[PDB]
Design a protein around this ligand. Sequence first.
Ligand SMILES: O=c1cc(O)n([C@@H]2O[C@H](COP(=O)(O)O)[C@@H](O)[C@H]2O)c(=O)[nH]1
Ligand SMILES: O=c1cc(O)n([C@@H]2O[C@H](COP(=O)(O)O)[C@@H](O)[C@H]2O)c(=O)[nH]1
Lengths: 218, 218
Amino acid sequence: MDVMNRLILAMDLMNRDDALRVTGEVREYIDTVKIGYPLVLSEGMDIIAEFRKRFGCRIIADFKVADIPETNEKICRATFKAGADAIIVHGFPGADSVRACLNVAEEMGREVFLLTEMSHPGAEMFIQGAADEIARMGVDLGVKNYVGPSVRPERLSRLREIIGQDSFLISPGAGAQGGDPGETLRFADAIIVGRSIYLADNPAAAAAGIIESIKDLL
Amino acid sequence: MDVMNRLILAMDLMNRDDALRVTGEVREYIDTVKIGYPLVLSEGMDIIAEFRKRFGCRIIADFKVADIPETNEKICRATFKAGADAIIVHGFPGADSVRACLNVAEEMGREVFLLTEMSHPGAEMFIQGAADEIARMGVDLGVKNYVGPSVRPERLSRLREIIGQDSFLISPGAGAQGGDPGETLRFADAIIVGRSIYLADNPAAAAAGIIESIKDLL
Ligand SMILES: O=c1cc(O)n([C@@H]2O[C@H](COP(=O)(O)O)[C@@H](O)[C@H]2O)c(=O)[nH]1
Ligand SMILES: O=c1cc(O)n([C@@H]2O[C@H](COP(=O)(O)O)[C@@H](O)[C@H]2O)c(=O)[nH]1
């Protein structure tokens, strides 16, 4: 996956009008948008088609899929049928649940991202201790795309070590959660940014500024 | 909540006409329906209102919420706005993520169910080792409703022990995944059943049959 400016917009606005407006405002800077449940549950799966029609951006469905295999398969099918290019899947529920997503993605020609360690403080309770193993599991399963936390660069570094330089790694937590874009891009291929852009008075300027701060990494 | 016949239908059909037909056919036996992402992502969040309009059923939104606290809040808000009585939340992302859901539920007068251990084989990799602590964390947070696996009675028993007799416990995995309704109701207040009912030639007969088998526990 070739992410423009190593920057993925986390479009978590919950109003169709606002979401389309803000994404339109930053379209020149990004070609990849992560759409999650806040938007989808508020506006419907048709929002994915709407984004594709208006922007042509790649769409990563951030559904943190975390069900049993049978249900995971149904979720992935519905998601890819709606036009998502990729889906984010939790690794914590284990290998079979991940494989179920990999199977659908393989059949439909889409991508799975494996979420290994999360960026919020609660991640330290259970996820962090399992994260290295989750990443190794992804490697065993042939997962090529991963998600890890901007706010813990030492953990992001470990994740990168595990998956190798050829795997694709994206990382949320830059900006609002305190992660630094430049430091994060030492290890991740692209950063995910939501509030620092979409809550900005001027989202275009916010996007431009982030990109300016990392220009030597582009 | 008072679940009729201790039986919750997992309506994971992905076609609105089929979902409505089957639910309507079993409505005499079940007043609580679990609606997850397979149906919601196929038919939209409007499906929740449609079920409310057609049937006298409580709706549990099985969305396995597993994001950071800020995103969890948005998901719960969108879900309760759509008319869900309750939402199911993963505990593995930790206490802050759960607390975020509890805050919205308290604010909107709805219920949170904490998913502790899952019923699929992959659950043994990471979730199982954390499940006792997740349950205990639920108790510390004041969570009153829990989900645990029908297919591991020993684990379901431990869960019930941790949360106490006053907590409400529902359990999937009966039927298609090999769990036994009767054994499961030794520990769970209600069982969740999907395929054994919705894939039956006569779903009403399938539900009636299950209820008949546990008649003494009602
Ligand atoms: O570990 C993770 C994984 C995520 O997907 N996310 C997601 O990435 C986005 C981060 O948004 P923000 O830049 O406003 O913090 C949100 O959509 C959130 O759900 C995260 O914050 N941490
Ligand atoms: O540990 C769990 C937690 C669940 O929510 N579920 C859900 O419960 C339902 C079980 O359906 P079924 O009876 O067809 O196996 C599905 O909707 C599934 O996503 C589960 O099977 N195991």
